[PDB]
């Protein structure tokens, strides 16, 4: 719940299929890579073992 | 004073009571003789005016309507005092009497103002300018005539302020003499109003003075009139008011937008009055007060097509020429613009038929309040937010 400076905070869980998370930067520069702050399966109720 | 045997009348009761037949009943003279009296009143004269012979329900709505009228009369009283200050300045600066003050042109204004500048009181010239300039707005003797007549009609609907204008010892002008009066100017003026505007009880709601249950029932009893006295005739099977001369000329008292709005089930479509005049359907919906609810009154295109095609079957009117529309009406009252666009756009009424049916629409000048203009502009929510907005 508290984030450091140079440490990247949580990634935004994209929609399920995650085909359009790069198609919705079609407006953006053509060659953009996957966004590092995006995730298909980021669940913060994921209980680690 | 609200002594026993005295109870809040109705409009029929008021017509039967305050009906004496004289014709030298000048609207703007009886009204000014009533309003100056209510300006010389003092705040205890509003004290004993709730007839004690009522349940707890009606007594508080009585105090409610009463402090409404009382605020309204004090507004008019301060307006009229600032007005008599304006007339006094114009008269004291020019010499002309206040009587002839209320009709001088902007032409006379410029002429007299140049006169004033010639001898050197330009500050006084501008004082007269602004006095006259806003007196041109409010100095018309029938300035808010219809809502003065309506608040007086509410007063006379109380049964309490019936004697309070009379019997006052009064002093005379320079022939300094004391004498009781008897002229119940309220009796005269209310008789004149009841006898002149037999639809005054509908203008009352329309002007919003009927805060409890605002102008809806008045709108229905006005639509039924403007349809029955326009089309040859339109019966009362319950709430349906449709003709016999065989157009599809219906006015349908569908229901209550707001009671439906805030009642158990949430929908989006609920017209007040469905007016069908051949190929054209019109759903009149009285806007609500929850700006969070005015967003779910206008029916959706699914509804506006589902009424179109259901009507084209049942009403038999051909499909290509079926044009379902909406008409939103201001939430608590009705501005003259909305009465214009009820009659003209919705009903088939031309000026010589209106001026014959609703002869007071000429005096109506109620407009939209600034807090109220935005009732029609609804908030647009996309189709991915059906879970957030209303």
């Amino acid at each position: 719940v508290a984030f450091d400076f140079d440490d990247q905070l949580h990634p935004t869980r994209t929609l399920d299929n995650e085909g359009d998370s790069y198609a919705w930067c079609a407006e953006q520069d053509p060659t953009l890579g996957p966004h590092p702050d995006l995730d298909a399966s980021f669940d913060p109720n994921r209980r680690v073992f | 004073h609200a002594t026993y045997d005295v109870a809040p009348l109705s409009h029929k009761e008021l017509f039967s009571i305050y009906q004496n037949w004289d014709k030298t009943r000048d609207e703007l003279d009886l009204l000014e003789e009533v309003e100056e009296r209510i300006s010389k009143w003092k705040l205890n004269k509003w004290e004993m005016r709730i007839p004690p012979l009522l349940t707890a329900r009606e007594k508080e709505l009585m105090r409610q309507q009463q402090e409404l009228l009382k605020s309204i009369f004090f507004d008019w009283g301060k307006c009229r005092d600032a007005l008599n200050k304006d007339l006094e300045l114009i008269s004291s600066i020019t010499g002309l009497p206040k009587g002839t003050v209320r009709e001088k042109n902007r032409a006379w204004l410029q002429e007299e103002a140049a006169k004033l500048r010639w001898v050197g009181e330009v500050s006084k010239a501008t004082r007269l300018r602004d006095a006259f300039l806003r007196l041109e707005v409010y100095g018309s003797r029938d300035h808010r005539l219809l809502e003065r007549l309506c608040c007086i009609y509410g007063l006379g609907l109380q049964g309490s302020f019936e004697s309070a204008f009379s019997n006052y010892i009064v002093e005379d002008p320079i022939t300094k003499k004391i004498y009781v009066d008897e002229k119940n100017s309220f009796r005269d003026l209310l008789a004149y109003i009841i006898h002149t505007y037999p639809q005054i009880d509908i203008i009352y709601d329309f002007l919003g003075f009927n805060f409890i249950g605002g102008y809806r029932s008045s709108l229905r009893r006005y639509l039924e009139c403007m349809v029955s006295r326009s089309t040859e005739g339109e019966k009362i099977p319950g709430r349906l008011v449709f003709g016999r001369g065989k157009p599809a000329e219906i006015l349908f008292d569908f229901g209550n937008s707001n009671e439906s709005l805030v009642s158990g089930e949430c929908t989006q479509g609920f017209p007040d009055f469905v007016f069908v005049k051949g190929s054209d359907m019109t759903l009149i919906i009285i806007a609500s007060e929850n700006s969070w609810l005015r967003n779910r009154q206008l029916p959706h295109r699914k509804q506006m097509e589902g009424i179109a095609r259901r009507a084209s079957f049942v009403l038999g009117i051909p499909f290509s020429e079926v044009r379902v529309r909406n008409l939103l009406l201001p939430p608590t009252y009705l501005d003259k613009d909305s009465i214009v666009r009820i009659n003209e756009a919705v009903l088939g009424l031309s000026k010589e038929e209106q001026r014959n049916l609703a002869p007071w629409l000429e005096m109506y000048q109620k407009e939209l309040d600034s807090k109220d203009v935005d009732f029609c502009s609804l908030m647009k929510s996309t189709n991915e937010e059906e879970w957030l907005t209303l």
Partner: protein, 51 residues
């Protein structure tokens, strides 16, 4: 004189709907003056105190 005093009350009337919202104007509407036009009566107010 602070908050513990008896209250001072509204130096006006507290009305409902059609009081000062564009209906008309009270006596507090003709005496108020726009800055451009001069005062009625002349005073030799200082510039420094004016500002």
């Amino acid at each position: 004189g602070g908050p513990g005093s008896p209250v001072k009350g509204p130096g006006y009337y507290a009305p409902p709907m059609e009081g000062e919202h564009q209906r008309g104007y009270t006596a507090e509407w003709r005496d108020l003056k726009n800055p451009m036009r001069p005062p009625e009566f002349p005073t030799p107010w200082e510039r420094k105190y004016k500002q």
